[PDB]
Amino acid sequence: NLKPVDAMQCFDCHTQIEDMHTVGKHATVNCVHCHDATEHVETASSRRMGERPVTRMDLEACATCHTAQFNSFVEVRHESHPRLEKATPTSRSPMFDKLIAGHGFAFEHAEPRSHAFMLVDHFVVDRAYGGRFQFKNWQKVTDGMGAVRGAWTVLTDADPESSDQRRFLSQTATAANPVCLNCKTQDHILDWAYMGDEHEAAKWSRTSEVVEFARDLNHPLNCFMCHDPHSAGPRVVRDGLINAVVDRGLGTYPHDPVKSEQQGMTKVTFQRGREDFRAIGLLDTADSNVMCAQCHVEYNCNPGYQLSDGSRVGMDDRRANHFFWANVFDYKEAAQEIDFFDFRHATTGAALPKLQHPEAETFWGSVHERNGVACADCHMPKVQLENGKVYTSHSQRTPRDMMGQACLNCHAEWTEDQALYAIDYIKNYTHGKIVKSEYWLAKMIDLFPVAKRAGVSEDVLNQARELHYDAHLYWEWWTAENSVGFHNPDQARESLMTSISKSKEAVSLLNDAIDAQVAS
């Protein structure tokens, strides 16, 4: 059985923790629930760690006292189709392969499924580790609880003796790097310096061998990514987000300084050897928009290239761990700001951005956001009980599964069918515009080989390539973003119309140029 330790003794050296722990709603929660610090206490000095204490990162460390939130979190939504490739005609991006050609996502980009699987899914996706990691067998793909208990209880490593990224299956890529992990797990929260910068106290950084790093990681979406385990207060731990909101002074709501101030973030730094090591962001309120923005944002988490001169930006560069913290219409400017793009299109040669699930940045300025609605309101609402102690659902899922709590309490004028219809109206419309944007992107892309081969000049090709950047941006945001427009219908519509415009302009440029080459 657990035996409590003397927290006062800890507090003599751990004044930051004391200040947090003694004041919050974990004041009575003994350190032994999450730390085995016996050898540590025997060996540490006021500034030297001595023996490293054991810190539990497993979610069951919170499940003993918070079973309801734990069981609700680990629930698997079987209706969320698993391993479902987005580049298929019945999914999000029917022409994805043509449009993303040149990028590692061509190897596999599946729809998201339940949070329990984020880490294992990160490990086994075809684009990530050369196929090195696989479920032990195809039965394990169902095991949400197992995945939560640890990725390595359900996965195998094709070659435990090597640690290099390489291809074990022919049609895989090795795009995983250590930055990715920060949106999958925070098991490494004590082993990773802020931003993944080199640091004498960090086991792991942006430049680590990601395969070795992966082997050290177990748990998806740790409960403490949103809840400080010492104060039990709301926080974020994602470096990239703290960096955008606080270091870069952009605010939690970059479009709204008042709301930014009311619902702010305070960066708290923890040191190793009296050097800054890691940081968390304590939230003024339990603001799920910002909690979810730890991961549901457009980011760099990868090497790239400079827009200016095309030189490699490696993992060693800060820009490999970056939250643009910009909506779709400020994105190009934000990418220019850091002088960065992701890949050159394999057919057009255009330098292109790669967009990632920008739900947070899409949600800004939308009607629900302006009305003070947050992600949790639609995606993890309070449970309604005829008789019971209320708690917040932690099953982050479509509102379709809980329409009464997620929509209809606020929308009393609607039945469930009407609320669903309103969603489908926006998604249907938006998806039609996505598909039309892809049609036009594909039409332009197919003209590039024709133009090159007809001898169209590099100047025209480059003009078309510059158009491709925008056509691509204003389309890809929306296949990347998971609400199919619902989070911001007007913005989706304007963006997708811009994409089609850009592609149409490029098509007409390329067609005329080809025709002039043929007539000459």
Q: Report 330-349 residues binding ligand HEC (CB under 6 A).
A: none
Half-sphere exposure of 458 (CA within 13 A, CB side): 0
Distance, CA of 513 to CA of 440 (rounded, Å): 18
Told to check if 398 binds Na ion by CB under 5 A, we report yes
The answer to whether residues 204 and 191 touch, using CB atoms and an 8 Å cutoff, is: yes
Tokens of 364: 């800004």
Pick the closer one to Ca ion by CB: 112 or 349.
112
Instruction: Detail the residues annotated as belonging to a binding site.
Output: 10, 13-14, 26, 31, 34-35, 40, 62, 65-66, 115, 180, 183-184, 223, 226-227, 230, 292, 295-296, 298-299, 354, 356, 368, 375, 378-379, 394, 407, 410-411, 487
Contacts of 204 (CB under 8 A, 6+ apart): 178, 188, 191, 192, 196, 213, 216
Pick the closer one to a second copy by CB: 83 or 318.
83
* Binding characters for Na ion, 54-83, by CB under 5 A (x = yes): --------------------------x---
Closest residue by Cα to residue 123 from 75, 174, 160: 174
Q: Which residues from 276-335 bind ligand HEC, rule CB under 6 A?
A: 278, 280, 286, 288, 291-292, 295-297, 299, 301-302
Told to check if 467 binds ligand HEC by CB under 6 A, we report no
The answer to whether residues 357 and 456 touch, using CB atoms and an 8 Å cutoff, is: no
Give me the least distance between CB of 86 and a second copy, in Å please: 8
Give me the least distance between CB of 224 and Na ion, in Å please: 23
Told to check if 62 binds ligand HEC by CB under 6 A, we report yes
Give me the least distance between CB of 192 and ligand HEC, in Å please: 10
One-letter amino acid of 202: A
Closest residue by Cα to residue 10 from 50, 49, 37: 37
Contacts of 26 (CB under 8 A, 6+ apart): 229, 230, 231, 232
First to last CA, the chain: 88
Q: Which residues from 407-466 bind Ca ion, rule CB under 5 A?
A: none
Told to check if 260 binds Na ion by CB under 5 A, we report no
Pick the closer one to a second copy by CB: 145 or 282.
145
Q: Which does 398 bind (CB under 5 to 8 A by kind): a second copy, Na ion, Ca ion, none?
A: Na ion
Distance, CA of 305 to CA of 259 (rounded, Å): 35
Distance, CA of 502 to CA of 99 (rounded, Å): 14
Q: Which does 346 bind (CB under 5 to 8 A by kind): a second copy, Na ion, ligand HEC, none?
A: none
Pick the closer one to Na ion by CB: 84 or 442.
84
Burial readout 228-261 (b: 16 or more C-beta within 10 A, e: otherwise): bbbbbbbbbbbbbbbbbbbeeebbbbbebeebbe
* Binding characters for Ca ion, 95-114, by CB under 5 A (x = yes): ----------------xx--
Q: Which does 296 bind (CB under 5 to 8 A by kind): Na ion, ligand HEC, Ca ion, none?
A: ligand HEC
Closest residue by Cα to residue 151 from 135, 165, 130: 135
Told to check if 285 binds Na ion by CB under 5 A, we report no
Give me the least distance between CB of 342 and ligand HEC, in Å please: 10
Told to check if 78 binds ligand HEC by CB under 6 A, we report no
Closest residue by Cα to residue 124 from 108, 113, 106: 108
Torsion of CA 491, 293, 243, 475, to 10 degrees: -30
Closest residue by Cα to residue 396 from 125, 66, 77: 77
Pick the closer one to ligand HEC by CB: 116 or 451.
116
Contacts of 432 (CB under 8 A, 6+ apart): none
| Residue selected from 4, 39, 52, 449 as contacting ligand HEC according to rule CB under 6 A | 52
Cα dihedral across residues 255, 256, 261, 263: positive or negative: negative
Told to check if 464 binds ligand HEC by CB under 6 A, we report no
Pick the closer one to a second copy by CB: 67 or 162.
67
Contacts of 86 (CB under 8 A, 6+ apart): 92, 93, 96, 109, 110, 111, 479
Q: Which does 354 bind (CB under 5 to 8 A by kind): Na ion, a second copy, Ca ion, none?
A: Ca ion
Q: Which residues from 354-373 bind ligand HEC, rule CB under 6 A?
A: 357, 367-368, 371, 373
Instruction: Detail the residues annotated as belonging to a binding site for heme.
Output: 10, 13-14, 26, 31, 34-35, 40, 62, 65-66, 115, 180, 183-184, 223, 226-227, 230, 292, 295-296, 368, 375, 378-379, 394, 407, 410-411, 487
By CB under 6 A, the count of residues binding ligand HEC is 103
Contact region for Ca ion (CB under 5 A) — 327-335, 348-356, 487-495, 500-508? 348-356
| Residue selected from 26, 66, 259, 397 as contacting Na ion according to rule CB under 5 A | 397
Contact region for Ca ion (CB under 5 A) — 19-27, 72-80, 115-123, 359-367? 72-80
Tokens of 233: 């207060």
Applying CB under 5 A, the residues found at the interface with Na ion are: 80, 397-398
Applying CB under 5 A, the residues found at the interface with Ca ion are: 80, 111-112, 354, 356
